[PDB]
Amino acid sequence: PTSTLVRVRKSAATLGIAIEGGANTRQPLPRIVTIQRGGSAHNCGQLKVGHVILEVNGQTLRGKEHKEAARIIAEAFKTKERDYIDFLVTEFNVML
Amino acid sequence: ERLTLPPSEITLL
């Protein structure tokens, strides 16, 4: 498949990802540059450095500036509504 | 690796 739905359960106190990209850059969708060992993202074993995030809990990140997309992810981790985050990701490069 | 160039932001989450 082009994309894969990855559920990241909040199994640790931290999420542990670093992202680049967004509408205001040459990487239109946010891309994972780092995965910290011990965080919820590394704990799920399904997220990878280079993964491009298309959606967060069904919300598209297309058109969102870097800081808006980062804020969407930060709020998905802090919310008490659910104890996980659903990331729709792709291993393919996304340049437009 | 980074695909964006230095001026472009990185956010730690």
Side-chain angles (χ1 to χ4, degrees):
Chain A
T2 54
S3 70
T4 291
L5 188 65
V6 172
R7 178 158 298 187
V8 174
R9 198 176 55 80
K10 303 170 195 183
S11 64
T14 66
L15 173 56
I17 72 178
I19 59 157
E20 73 175 338
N24 50 346
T25 80
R26 76 174 186 176
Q27 175 52 62
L29 285 158
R31 180 174 177 277
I32 299 175
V33 295
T34 295
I35 296 174
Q36 281 296 313
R37 177 164 296 264
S40 296
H42 188 273
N43 288 352
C44 86
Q46 303 160 289
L47 283 188
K48 309 171 183 183
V49 164
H51 261 154
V52 173
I53 312 166
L54 307 182
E55 297 181 7
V56 178
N57 298 324
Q59 177 175 12
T60 181
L61 299 184
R62 186 165 284 282
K64 299 298 195 320
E65 297 201 54
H66 175 88
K67 285 204 277 295
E68 303 178 303
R71 281 191 202 92
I72 286 163
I73 305 171
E75 292 305 317
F77 189 74
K78 297 186 298 168
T79 190
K80 295 184 208 174
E81 291 306 299
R82 68 199 71 79
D83 66 359
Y84 62 87
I85 307 168
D86 280 343
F87 295 101
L88 184 62
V89 297
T90 182
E91 284 193 65
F92 297 165
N93 306 309
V94 183
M95 291 190 195
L96 282 180
Chain B
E1 204 189 28
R2 283 191 62 151
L3 294 190
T4 65
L5 297 154
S8 284
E9 306 164 273
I10 301 298
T11 300
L12 307 177
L13 296 155

